[PDB]
Design a binder for these strands. Structure first.
Ligand code: MET
Ligand SMILES: [Mg+2]
Lengths: 252, 365, 90, 111
RNA sequence: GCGCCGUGGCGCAGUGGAAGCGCGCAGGUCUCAUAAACCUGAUGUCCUCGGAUCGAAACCGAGCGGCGCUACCA
């Protein structure tokens, strides 16, 4: 069986923003599964589901669908969630959505590994997601940091390096657009442009011809932000290297 | 590089471009739902079986690698009653032509005539009429058309302008066409010593007429870009190409090499003496009829303060009539004309919304 | 250059009773919308309501079953073409 | 049920059947497509002959049989006048189709 | 060829598990009836094909169509 909570500790906190997938409607409201915190059952009492009277229940809330929510009453003993949908402020909603997305992404990461090798899920959770969270706040932030520069994976060890490699691969060449508008109208201008390209493309990406004045090259990114540094270099080359030819070039 | 410039005039969809395809292989790309819209372009090698199209005689009789006579070039015009203004333009590069009539449609069809008389007007006197779509007709029909042709080709300047029926679709009889065009469309001498002068009809392109250009010369374009005035553009011949193959120099007959801006511009020697006129003295004559449309209404004489298309060289300019004498009118132009010599021009009027060829003359300075 | 024929969708929308609604989708955004609505209101017995769509599109409401009549009126009062119209429903 | 159920529809009773015999043409009587359904019993209906006309509802169908737009209709033309004419019998959609198939009316308009 | 829309029908939007909105058609429910008001839809996995990874329409390619760049590339 697959279980275990999204965050570090077992039980939710007061005034925690959650996203709730609707299961079934009863009397109090709905016995929803909180997708920001484990799968513990809770309810939205019929007073705090919407800001205004909307009469219809199965169009603004909907069975099977997700709702932007906040946790009101929590009892750290066994398992009760008194929940609200109304108390979520304007804006804020977007943030909540983002958080939910992040959580989902995190969840997606932690299952492939399990599939590849069974072994207790709690242990896996401990060795992948929690220490980072403790250090900062959320696991997605940690993941982002890792992607930017690999150091968070060095902190707590994965069960195998293969998994890490796979993750890296998943994260990974990324195409970045680079458009060159050369102000040429001469017969031997195209050739010149080509020559210029050949001195800049070498030593490291994919140059596409659209027109005689317009040239569109796609630059590869290995670690996402590595593509910006190559683009910059290319730009520099246009201003510094291409001066001997005397061909006027413009960048979008 | 190609020796000569052969034009393929004629009415619309008679297959001009298709005949060019049976002769060279080349298409004008197309326009793909319509038809030829820019002047098409294509070249080819003509050799002969002493003992053709490719150095290969073993196609007929036998092997002895056919002897190369010349390499020619074509200019596929369009056929549509309204592309008149370009076809005119195009003629300025021709050294001769081939009139593609359609075997299965009423002989003097609007544009067929419009063209023909344009030809006899500008000077393109080396003509070959061609009866195209005979692959879809009765063996009687194509001969009776040959009659109406042999009868039109009478009073007119067209003595023995032969008429070679073809099938541009199944490429049949083309070799007798190559023999016509190997007899009648002879390759004109051109003194090179003359002032290097050439016409432009594309650019991404144009034809030389007198002189010769070489890699690395200093050159100018006229009238050039505008301000309202019009100044010449200077540059260096970065390169020379005919067809897909590069050459170091370039001589008349052929076309050489954004959207097509300097259309109707000309290229000459940098530091050369050519007038960039705004106002011009035409000597002139009219047709008695308006041969072109699908109605022959009789040509009204020129009234002053009238707008007329003045087709000069490759260029196509619009202008207003300041003077009206017997055969000398003075015209004021929107866009300047660089007058390289003495010259030929072609004069048109917006008859019924669409423009129409009505008369001609000679530029005068 | 501008496109001469654009898809104007006059749809069947169900209104109070057996009655219907002339709803217009894909409206040309060149003339003043409010003014046109006012004009429409004046000409017929209709009330004009505009439902806004992001980037492109504005749903223009006119209470009632006219269609052809509406088209004729549009033709009469300059702002919209003849070829652009399409009747949607039945 | 006829139109809208009602408390006040059970005091009527309609007897014709869907499986009724189709009525043919007479003298001074011909077929019309309805151009636009007008007010107060009046109706604009273009005839299959080639005249515009002004059609009028005459009794009988005034409450019993409701009508819509673009319907094939029996019109007995006025013998003394011409511009004003009267509707006699409404044709069913199936009936109309059958007529079309037969070729009794000229094939110009669709159901 | 690039970019977005790739549907469960049209017209609008979102990218790593959650059948996204407005209209339309198809059908229901409520009322004596229609409309508003309500739900359910339809090629089951959101271009065609398969894979890395359990998986996904989303990640990757070969392969198509509409337009945001091109101007006919001898
Ligand atoms: C139309 S440009 C002139 C023809 C040339 N061979 C190219 O192709
Ligand atoms: Mg009774």
């Amino acid at each position: 069986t697959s279980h275990c909570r999204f965050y570090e500790n077992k039980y939710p906190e007061i005034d925690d923003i959650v996203m709730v997938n609707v299961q079934q409607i009863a009397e109090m409201g709905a016995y929803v599964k909180l997708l920001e915190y484990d799968n513990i059952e809770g309810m939205i009492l019929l007073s705090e589901l919407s800001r205004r009277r909307i009469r219809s229940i199965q169009k603004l809330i909907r069975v099977g669908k997700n709702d932007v929510a906040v946790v009101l009453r929590v009892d750290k003993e066994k398992g009760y969630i008194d929940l609200s949908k109304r108390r979520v402020s304007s804006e804020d909603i977007i943030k909540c959505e983002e958080k939910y997305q992040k959580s989902k992404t995190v969840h997606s990461i932690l299952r492939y590994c399990a599939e590849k090798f069974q072994i207790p899920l709690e242990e896996l959770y401990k060795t992948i997601a929690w220490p980072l969270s403790r250090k900062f706040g959320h696991a997605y932030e940690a993941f982002k940091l890792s992607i930017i520069d690999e150091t968070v994976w060095e902190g707590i060890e994965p069960p195998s390096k293969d998994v890490l490699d796979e993750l890296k691969n998943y994260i990974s060449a990324v195409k970045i657009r680079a458009d060159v508008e050369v102000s040429c109208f001469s017969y031997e201008g195209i050739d010149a442009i080509k020559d210029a390209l050949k001195s800049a493309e070498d030593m490291s990406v994919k140059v596409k011809l659209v027109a005689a004045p317009l040239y569109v090259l796609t630059t590869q990114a290995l670690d996402k932000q590595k593509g910006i540094e190559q683009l910059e270099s290319a730009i520099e080359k246009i201003t510094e290297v291409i001066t001997k030819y005397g061909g006027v070039c413009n960048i979008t | 590089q190609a020796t000569i410039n052969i034009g393929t005039i004629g009415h619309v969809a008679h297959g001009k471009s298709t005949v060019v395809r049976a002769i060279s292989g080349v298409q004008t790309v197309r326009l793909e739902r319509n038809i030829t819209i820019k002047l098409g372009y294509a070249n080819a090698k003509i050799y002969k079986c002493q003992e053709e199209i490719s150095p290969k005689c073993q196609r007929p009789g036998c092997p002895g690698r056919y002897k190369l006579v010349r390499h020619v070039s074509f200019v596929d015009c369009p056929g549509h009653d309204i592309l008149m203004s370009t076809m005119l333009s195009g003629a300025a590069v021709m050294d001769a032509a081939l009139l593609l009539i359609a075997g299965n449609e009423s002989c003097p069809q609007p544009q067929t005539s419009e063209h023909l008389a344009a030809i006899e007007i500008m000077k393109l006197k080396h003509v070959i009429i061609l009866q195209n779509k005979v692959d879809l007709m009765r063996e009687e029909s194509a001969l009776e058309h040959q009659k109406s042709i042999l009868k039109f080709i009478r009073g007119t300047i067209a003595d023995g302008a032969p008429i070679v029926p073809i099938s541009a679709q199944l490429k049949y009889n083309i070799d007798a066409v190559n023999e016509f065009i190997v007899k009648t469309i002879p390759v004109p001498p051109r003194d090179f010593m003359i002032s290097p002068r050439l016409i432009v009809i594309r650019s991404f392109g144009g034809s030389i007429l007198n002189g010769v250009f070489k890699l690395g010369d200093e050159i100018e374009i006229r009238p050039g870009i505008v301000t309202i005035q019009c100044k010449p553009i200077f540059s260096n011949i970065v390169s020379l190409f005919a067809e897909q193959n590069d050459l170091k120099f370039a001589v008349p007959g052929g076309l050489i090499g954004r959207a097509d801006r300097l259309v109707g511009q000309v290229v000459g020697a940098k530091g050369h003496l050519p007038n960039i006129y705004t106002d011009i003295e035409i000597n002139y004559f009219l047709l008695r009829r308006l041969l072109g449309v699908k109605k022959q209404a009789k040509v009204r004489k020129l009234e002053p303060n009238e707008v007329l298309m003045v087709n000069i060289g490759s260029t196509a300019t619009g202008a207003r009539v300041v003077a009206v004498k017997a055969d000398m009118a003075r015209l004021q132009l929107t866009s300047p004309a660089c007058t390289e010599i003495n010259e030929k021009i072609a004069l048109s009027r917006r008859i019924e919304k669409h423009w129409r060829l009505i008369g001609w003359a000679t530029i005068k300075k | 250059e501008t496109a001469t024929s654009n898809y104007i969708h006059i749809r069947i929308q169900q209104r109070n009773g057996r009655k219907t609604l002339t709803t217009v989708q894909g409206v040309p955004e060149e003339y003043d919308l409010k003014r046109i609505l006012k004009v429409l209101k004046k000409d017929f017995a209709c009330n004009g309501n505009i439902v806004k769509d992001p980037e492109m599109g504005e749903i223009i409401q006119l209470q009632g079953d006219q269609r052809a009549k509406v088209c004729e009126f549009m033709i009469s009062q300059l702002g919209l073409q003849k070829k652009n119209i399409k009747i949607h429903g039945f | 049920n006829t139109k809208g159920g009602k408390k006040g529809r059970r005091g009527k009773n309609d007897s014709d059947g869907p499986k009724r015999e189709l009525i043919y043409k007479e003298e001074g009587q011909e077929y019309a497509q309805i151009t636009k359904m007008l007010g107060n019993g009046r109706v604009e209906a273009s005839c299959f002959d080639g005249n515009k006309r002004m059609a009028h509802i005459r009794g009988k169908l005034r409450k019993k049989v409701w009508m819509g737009q673009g319907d094939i209709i029996l019109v007995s033309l006025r013998d003394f006048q011409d511009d004003q004419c009267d509707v006699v019998h409404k044709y069913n959609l199936d009936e109309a189709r059958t007529l079309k198939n037969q070729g009794e009316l000229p094939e110009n308009a669709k159901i």
